[PDB]
Amino acid sequence: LAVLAESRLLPLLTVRGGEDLLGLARVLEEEGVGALEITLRTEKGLEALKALRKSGLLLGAGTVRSPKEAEAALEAGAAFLVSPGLLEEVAALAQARGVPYLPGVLTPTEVERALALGLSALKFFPAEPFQGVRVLRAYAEVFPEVRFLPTGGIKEEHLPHYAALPNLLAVGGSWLLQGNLEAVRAKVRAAKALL
Amino acid sequence: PLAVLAESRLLPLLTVRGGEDLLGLARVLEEEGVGALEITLRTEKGLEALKALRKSGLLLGAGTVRSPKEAEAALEAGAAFLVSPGLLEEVAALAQARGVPYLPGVLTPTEVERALALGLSALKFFPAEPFQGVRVLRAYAEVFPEVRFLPTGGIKEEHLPHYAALPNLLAVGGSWLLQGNLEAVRAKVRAAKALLS
Amino acid sequence: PLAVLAESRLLPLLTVRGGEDLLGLARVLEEEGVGALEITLRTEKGLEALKALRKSGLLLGAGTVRSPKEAEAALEAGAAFLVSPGLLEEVAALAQARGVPYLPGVLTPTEVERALALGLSALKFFPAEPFQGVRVLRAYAEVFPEVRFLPTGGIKEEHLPHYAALPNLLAVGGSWLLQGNLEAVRAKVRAAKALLS
């Protein structure tokens, strides 16, 4: 997870075709972002993981819905797994394969269930609709051993507020990847400044 | 089985207190192209209302279902589908055994996944307005595109425009529709359909 | 079991850092008609504070309980009731074995239903303010009328008027009450009672 902690940002890419994936990889690396989450919303996601396999990025597969799908993502090139909510059988697969699994959670009951599965780096999703900054501030006090990766509706306007949180692994989202490579550079730098 | 809900786009929620004109309401709803009505089991007047409405022509839902035994009581009183505030696995078992739709309430992605694991893909989102329904459901449209949601809880006319843009709605539910007399109900239903277009 | 909480209407939450005048605080709370106090277990100081307050006349709660073993340590230090951030079924087992109240935190209707299935009907609602506490609890008053809630998390004076009107509150909990010296504590408690009335 050191790469994520170092990077502080986890860009989220839904692949629709035409993306300059290797150009993206180079830019992200140049800007000190060493990880990328590829969503599995389409079959294009797996192909993109394969295309990026050798790019130098720590690749995450997102929207994982099952252990079979998790395994397919790992075989395509993913180095870590992310799901919208907690899936105990995906936790089993990840532990079997020796890879990190960041399940989405929201509530304290869910945080406890993830911990009981040995998981202490957790996605908080969807962050903005569920008042992420204020929730995560609460969680910093009662779950101080947990690090969170809020994702969902995050935009520049919200970043200053997340910056003050002691319990963040990274901030995730698609906002970083809107526009051309020039725009990605600017958004990545702006985000690091705001954080 | 929920083609009626989907064409209706609206699911009025009635908590029965005594003195309601149930058959007049059913007539009005049908006239206005709303073919379903959820009757809450917040008290025992709810079961009597289902019975009274058995053969009105509406698809009747029973809400606030809290147990399999209460669900079975609702089916025997004339409910065609079951709704609970949160996810009740044993109610899902009863509904599946009886071949009726069950729309459990969920809020979080983990709860959506658990419902899917029980073979349920038409889910209530409850309570919708306090938990930022439009923005949450917008997020779920992307990550759970196989799921259709029925948000309910604090919905009012002011909120309907924002729900209109959602690709993943089965219907919008709530009691706001049924405030006032029958003329008011006609207006509120027509306004809601307009705001949801 | 929780008549004290109910009569108090307030549950002050103390995270102990060293230096606090615990026995003075206990005296003030009692004088002001607040008969309970929750001590968080965010560090080892918490257990020490429970021991220090053991015979102060307060109904002592242990907060931030994370396991059955920690729960048991809290009871042995003098806690009379147990509170956790979320629902821990094995803590419920320990509490029922020891004959003490356990107030688990819940947020969603599914979580309420799971706590009810464990025989638990006085529940914490946490974290209350970030999750739209007043409006969520208003919905729960209708669909879960047998449940009493203890909202905690980010509550401040400004929010109290809106909680006052809820029919399903066991008490309102939080640390805002304990910011300042003992005269400030007196003023905040009196203010909170007036705003909840």
Kindly state the helix (H) or strand (E) to which residue B45 belongs, with its residue range.
Answer: helix B45-53
The Cβ-side half-sphere exposure at A84, using a 13 Å CA radius, reads 24
The answer to whether A172 and A7 have CB atoms below 8 angstroms apart is no
Structure tokens at B121: 């893909």
Residue that the structure tokens 């997340």 belong to: A162
Determine the residue of chain C that is closest to A110 in CA distance.
Answer: C86
Cα B92 to the chain's mean position, in Å? 16
Residues for chain A: how many in total?
195
The answer to whether C5 and C11 have CB atoms below 8 angstroms apart is yes
Asked if C67 reaches chain B (Cβ–Cβ under 8 Å), the answer is no
Q: Any bridge partners for residue C37, and if so which?
A: C60
The answer to whether B104 and B92 have CB atoms below 8 angstroms apart is yes
Sheet holding A35-39, edge to edge: A147-150, A121-124, A101-105, A80-83, A58-62, A35-39, A9-13, A171-173
| Separation in Å, CA B168 to CA B140, C167, C182 | 8, 35, 54
Of the candidates B42, B88, B153, which has its C-beta nearest C113's C-beta? B88
Nearest CA among C107, C36, C105 for reference residue C66: C105
Give the minimum alpha-carbon distance from B164 to chain A in angstroms, rounded to a whole number.
18
Nearest CA among B197, B190, B180 for reference residue B21: B180
The answer to whether B168 and B138 have CB atoms below 8 angstroms apart is no
Contact A108 C108 (CB under 8 A): no
Determine the residue of chain B that is closest to A66 in CA distance.
Answer: B113
* Residues of chain C found within 8 Å of residue A110, distances taken between Cβ atoms: 86
Amino acid at A190: A
The answer to whether B9 and B30 have CB atoms below 8 angstroms apart is no
* Residues of C (108-167) whose Cβ lies below 8 Å from B: 108-113, 131-132, 135-136, 139, 142-145
CB < 8 Å & 24+ apart, contacts of B98-103 = B98/B72, B100/B1, B100/B75, B101/B1, B101/B2, B102/B71, B103/B61, B103/B150
Alpha-carbon distance of A152 to A52, in angstroms, equals 24
The answer to whether B178 and B39 have CB atoms below 8 angstroms apart is no
Q: Which experimental approach was used here? A: X-ray
Candidate list C70, C72, C124, C188, residue with the active-site label = C124
Alpha-carbon distance of C61 to C70, in angstroms, equals 13
Alpha-carbon distance of B89 to B114, in angstroms, equals 9
Structure tokens at B132: 């930022």
Would you call A43 a catalytic residue per the annotation? no
Give the minimum alpha-carbon distance from A131 to chain B in angstroms, rounded to a whole number.
9
Nearest CA among C163, C90, C124 for reference residue C13: C124
Phi/psi at B83 (5° precision): -135, 135
| Separation in Å, CA B68 to CA A193, B106, B122 | 55, 18, 19
Domains contained in chain A, CATH given: 1-195 (3.20.20.70)
C163's CB contacts (< 8 A; 6+ apart) are C133, C134, C137, C151, C155, C169, C172, C196
First-residue to last-residue Cα distance in chain C = 23
A55's CB contacts (< 8 A; 6+ apart) are A21, A22, A25, A26
* Residues of chain A found within 8 Å of residue B107, distances taken between Cβ atoms: 106
Sheet holding C122-125, edge to edge: C148-151, C122-125, C102-106, C81-84, C59-63, C36-40, C10-14, C172-174
Would you call A37 a catalytic residue per the annotation? yes
First-residue to last-residue Cα distance in chain B = 23
Asked if C173 reaches chain A (Cβ–Cβ under 8 Å), the answer is no
Whether the bond into B101 is cis, omega within 30 of 0 = no
Torsion angle defined by CA atoms of residues A152, C87, B71 and B96, in that order, rounded to the nearest 10 degrees: 60
* Residues of chain B found within 8 Å of residue C109, distances taken between Cβ atoms: 84-86, 105, 107, 126-127
Resolution of the experimental model in angstroms, please? 1.7
